[PDB]
C-alpha cells in the first residue's frame, strides 16, 4: 500500500544508507584517533632521544 | 624545585601514565564503540533489513 510501502522504503533506503554513512565515518574518526595516538608515541620516542677470576684461570687451564 | 620537579615529574609521569591508561581506554572505547556499532547497527539494522523480508508474506 502506497503509504506503508513508501514510508517503509524511505525507512530502508534513507535510514540504513545513513547508518552505513555513520559506520564509515565513525570508523574514520576512530582510525584518526589510533593513528594520532601512535604518532604521539613516535614523537615521545624521538623526544626522549632528545632527552637522551681464579676459577676462570683454572677453567682455562683444564679446558684448553 | 627538585621536589617540585619530582612532583611535577610525578604529575608529568602521572599524566603520561594516566594518558597511557586513557590512551588504552580511549582505544578501548574507540574499539568498543566501533565494535558495538559495527555489531549493533550492523546486526540490528540488518535485523530491520530482515524485517523488510521477515514481515513479508
Amino acid at each position: 500500500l502506497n503509504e506503508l510501502q513508501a514510508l517503509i522504503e524511505a525507512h530502508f533506503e534513507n535510514r540504513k544508507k545513513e547508518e552505513e554513512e555513520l559506520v564509515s565515518l565513525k570508523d574514520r574518526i576512530e582510525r584518526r584517533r589510533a593513528e594520532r595516538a601512535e604518532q604521539q608515541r613516535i614523537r615521545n620516542e624521538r623526544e626522549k632521544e632528545r632527552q637522551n677470576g681464579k676459577r676462570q684461570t683454572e677453567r682455562e687451564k683444564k679446558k684448553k | 624545585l627538585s621536589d617540585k620537579l619530582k612532583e611535577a615529574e610525578t604529575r608529568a609521569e602521572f599524566a603520561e601514565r594516566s594518558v597511557t591508561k586513557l590512551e588504552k581506554s580511549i582505544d578501548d572505547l574507540e574499539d568498543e564503540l566501533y565494535a558495538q556499532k559495527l555489531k549493533y547497527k550492523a546486526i540490528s539494522e540488518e535485523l530491520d533489513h530482515a524485517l523488510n523480508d521477515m514481515t513479508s508474506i
Binding site: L4, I8 | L51, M54, T55, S56, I57
Partner: peptide, 29 residues
Amino acid sequence: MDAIKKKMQMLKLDKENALDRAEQAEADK
C-alpha cells in the same frame, strides 16, 4: 513488525470472511 500486524489483520479479514462463508455455507444446509 507492524507491517505484519497489518498484514495479519488483512489475512485475518480474508480468512474470517472466507470462514464466515464456510460457516454460512454449511449453516445454509
